[PDB]
């Protein structure tokens, strides 16, 4: 919720 | 991106 | 109780 | 989300 990714 | 929060 | 998650 | 509180 505010960071990015992608996982 | 797939976890939650809130920050 | 006021934060989020998910655990 | 699974803990309690109260905050
Ligand atoms: C996750 O939180 C953001 C930021 O507030 C919100 O815009 C999204 O709609 C929210 O996603 C929902 O809630 C999560 C907990 C559910 O897993 C997701 O499927 C979506 O309903
Ligand atoms: C972030 O990534 C998700 C895919 O997991 C995608 O659904 C969103 O549209 C994407 O957010 C955009 O790109 C990020 C980099 C920007 O900060 C956000 O404002 C939105 O434009
Ligand atoms: C969690 O909170 C976000 C941001 O406020 C909201 O967009 C989501 O819908 C909310 O998730 C719901 O409520 C929580 C309590 C549940 O664990 C989740 O699965 C979803 O129903
Ligand atoms: C909080 O959790 C305890 C232990 O399970 C339960 O006995 C209480 O009913 C529960 O409180 C409710 O749910 C929480 C989320 C609300 O903040 C509280 O006001 C009460 O409705
Ligand atoms: C973001 C980019 C990635 C790491 N290559 C991909 O595997 C993931 C699903 O999305
Ligand atoms: C999620 C709930 C929170 C941690 N209490 C709030 O400060 C944040 C902006 O959103
Ligand atoms: C919230 C999202 C998560 C961390 N990917 C999931 O494992 C948990 C049960 O809910
Ligand atoms: C839960 C109980 C508490 C710590 N006394 C209160 O201050 C909070 C608002 O709710
Ligand atoms: Cl994120
Ligand atoms: Cl996330
Ligand atoms: Cl919480
Ligand atoms: Cl909780």
Dig out the tokens for C6 from the structure. Answer: 């998910």
CA closest to A7 among chain B residues: B1
Smallest Cβ–Cβ distance between C5 and the set D2, D4, D7 belongs to: D2
CA angle A7, B4, B5 (to 5 degrees): 125
Q: Report the alpha-carbon distance of residue B1 to residue D6 in Å, rounded.
A: 28
Residues from A in contact with B at Cβ < 8 Å: 1-7
Which residues fall within 8 angstroms of residue C2, CB to CB, at 6 or more apart?
A: D5, D7
Give the single-character DSSP code of B5.
B
Tell me which method was used to determine the 3D structure: X-ray
Smallest Cβ–Cβ distance between D6 and the set C1, C5, C6 belongs to: C1
Dig out the tokens for D7 from the structure. Answer: 């905050």
- Nearest in space to B5 (alpha carbons), one of A2, D2, D6: A2
Please check whether residue B1 is in contact with residue A4, taking contact to mean a CB–CB distance below 8 angstroms.
yes
């Amino acid at each position: 919720x505010x960071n990015x990714x992608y996982x």
